[PDB]
């Protein structure tokens, strides 16, 4: 229990972090490059990783009176990031941290589980108490600064010398194998925090004006000489394009749409991104997926603002989290969240006490009557297949695929037991869509109803170790971007959808919404749309 120097504690913290907090990155390195044939490269990778960790720890623990709190914070952050990068195989980018800071406690509670609590207690709390309960003496500023540079130069040498000795190998690694650099913790969380702070500063310094894109958008015919239109655009949460029956699936997860005539499903739809906060604004922005920037998504003009300005009253009935920045320029009286029982009349039908999606159709007739004569776009948000709790997104009426994964951890349930729960939640989504279609049909005698559904992103369910959405748009698996798309309309409105095999992306949503109300804007007119 003799007084230990701060520098040996810093080195021990760096060793512990490089040993325990980089399990996924080390496994990926040892599985891409076998240890039996790439001994030198893997050894240099370990050495440079330890050097980077030591450099990071020495730079943020420069002071003496903040050494212990900074070490505690680094240990806790490393453990909390490493658990999620290990079990769920997720990385940390600016978008991932943005999603992390836009969450509600209800969603966070599902991620919390006994195994995660035990792993932090063992990896970022027990070392926390070990570090906080030892005695450390700070020498004079001269010798302390001398030893600090010595450590700085040692870490810089351990970083650079393996790079120079393995110049070609590391050049190839940094040119071709970029994504592995995102699996290292807690360095990647620190870089993401810095980048996010820069983005937030740029957003704050940005003006508070609207960059217009559809100033020339004019309605072809007003809702006085024609039958007024009414579109229920069902924003979809997690769903996979290959898990629907129409595009090929052994099980029948969409039986209630087969008996509904007029439903057209497109087999190839690629979403804008793998996260809801990054995909929902991209659905409604006039910029395509190659130009859309999430940092300025809310400032740019969306199709919703154009539709509201042109005279089409709009309604949003939130269910999952929030409009994510798209329903902001319109009056608050139109955005009505349905997460809590204060608004959703259909709840407490399950032991989990969750409010379902079918309750969002209770009271739409009041809005229809209040808007008797004008176009409406009643957009509905879905809870969908939101994880890691697929078993809580459906009622026992749809408990058709047995067994189901009732556990809170995906790594323990077998693949079939997770597939069953996911498909049951898909069945619940199917039932919601069918009920929406029937509600549209009951108003056919006075409106030209139409329905459009598209999910914001896909899901990973065990392939290559990934288990949840959130991967960066640059190298995300295809299963996180393949989303189903359905369009149904009455056989008298004269709306002809495209072929089922047409290749479309999330950029096709705005042209479809504009074409539904016969609005032509040169900013988006030359884009593929779900309908002719």
């Amino acid at each position: 229990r003799r007084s230990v120097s701060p520098f040996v504690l810093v080195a021990s913290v760096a060793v512990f972090l490089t040993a325990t907090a980089n399990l996924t990155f080390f496994d990926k390195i040892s599985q891409t490059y076998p240890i039996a044939d790439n001994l030198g490269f893997v050894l240099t990778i370990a050495v440079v990783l330890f050097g980077a960790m030591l450099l990071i720890t020495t730079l943020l623990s420069s002071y003496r009176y903040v050494l212990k709190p900074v070490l505690i914070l680094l240990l806790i952050m490393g453990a909390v990031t490493s658990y999620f990068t290990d079990t769920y195989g997720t990385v940390y980018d600016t978008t991932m941290l943005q999603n992390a800071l836009q969450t509600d406690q209800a969603e966070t509670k599902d991620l919390l589980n006994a195994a995660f609590i035990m792993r932090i207690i063992g990896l970022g709390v027990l070392p926390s108490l070990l570090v906080a309960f030892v005695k450390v003496d700070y020498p004079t500023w001269g010798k302390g600064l001398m030893r600090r540079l010595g450590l700085i130069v040692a870490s810089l040498a351990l970083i650079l010398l393996p790079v120079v000795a393995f110049s070609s190998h590391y050049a190839s690694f940094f040119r071709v194998h970029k994504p592995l650099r995102s699996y290292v913790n807690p360095i990647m969380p620190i870089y993401s925090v810095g980048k996010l702070a820069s983005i937030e500063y740029k957003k704050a310094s940005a003006p508070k004006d609207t960059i217009y894109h559809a100033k020339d958008a004019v309605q072809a015919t007003k809702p006085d000489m024609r039958k007024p239109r009414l579109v229920v655009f069902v924003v979809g949460e997690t769903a996979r394009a290959d898990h629907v029956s129409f595009n090929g699936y052994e099980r029948d997860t969409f039986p209630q749409l087969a008996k509904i005539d007029g439903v057209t499903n497109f087999s190839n739809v690629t979403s804008c991104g793998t996260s809801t906060a990054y995909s929902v604004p991209c659905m409604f922005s006039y910029l395509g997926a190659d130009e859309y920037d999430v940092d300025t998504a809310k400032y740019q003009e969306n199709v919703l603002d154009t539709l509201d300005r042109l005279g089409v009253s709009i309604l949003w009935r939130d269910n999952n989290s929030d409009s994510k920045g798209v329903m902001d320029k319109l009056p608050k009286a139109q955005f009505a969240d349905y997460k809590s029982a204060t608004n959703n009349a259909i709840c407490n039908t399950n032991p989990y006490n969750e409010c379902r999606d079918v309750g969002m159709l209770v009271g739409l007739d009041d809005f229809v009557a209040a808007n008797n004569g004008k176009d409406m776009l009643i957009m509905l948000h879905q809870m969908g297949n939101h994880g890691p709790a697929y078993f809580k997104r459906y009622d026992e009426k749809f408990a058709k695929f047995t067994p189901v994964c009732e556990g809170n951890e995906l790594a323990k349930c077998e693949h079939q037991s997770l597939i069953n729960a996911y498909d049951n939640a898909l069945l619940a989504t199917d039932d919601f869509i069918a009920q929406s279609i029937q509600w549209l049909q009951t108003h056919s005698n006075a409106y030209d109803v139409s329905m459009l559904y598209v999910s914001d992103h896909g899901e990973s369910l065990g392939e290559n170790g990934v288990y949840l959405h959130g991967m960066p748009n640059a190298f995300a698996p295809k299963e996180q971007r393949s989303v189903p798309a359905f369009f149904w309309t009455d056989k008298q409105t004269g709306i002809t959808p495209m072929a089922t095999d047409t290749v479309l992306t999330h950029d096709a949503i705005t042209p479809t919404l504009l074409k539904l109300f016969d609005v032509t804007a040169d900013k988006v007119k030359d884009r593929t749309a779900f309908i002719r």
Partner: antibody
Amino acid sequence: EVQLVESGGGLVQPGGSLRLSCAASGFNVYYSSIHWVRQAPGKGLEWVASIYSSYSSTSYADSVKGRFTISADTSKNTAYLQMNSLRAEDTAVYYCASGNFSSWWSHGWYALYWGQGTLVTVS
Amino acid sequence: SPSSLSASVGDRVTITCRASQSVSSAVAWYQQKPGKAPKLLIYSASSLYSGVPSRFSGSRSGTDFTLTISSLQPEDFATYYCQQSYWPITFGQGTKVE
């Protein structure tokens, strides 16, 4: 050992379609590397595409761009190259070749093992 | 299109390929037998792959990479292709010996 074998040849018509398979046996798992190199009859080798299944990063050789699209089934350890709108020049023998292993101070990442090749004849 | 450049046999041979991109760490040669799949002989433009007792040595000279075979070739007589860059990949025009 590595046993990359190819399947899905046969006769096709111009403007048709085809879909090949590769990556049999365990070899170096499956993910990362593995390419596609074709050879016209009595002509030198020409690179077609390079899948990097894991990161969803692919590439094409211009003359085969806009019609070719590579899929990847890691569950079954098999790579697929989807061909659409074939023309007369597309006739060739198609191989698939991985790349891995660097020893020490030697690098690597080359199209090292291949297969017997599947003839793709258009007419 | 193939080319029978050396066409000498029974002595050392030298075949050159012009690398538009330097990428000296991503240059390799392949021995394609007339009916079989190509071999990998000589990689990284300076190293050797298992399967030959240093017959094919290989070397570099500025932007031009050449292949050298030292011993006589009673078994060989195949076609060799230079391979420049890995992402993307371009192959040379090929060579033949007789």
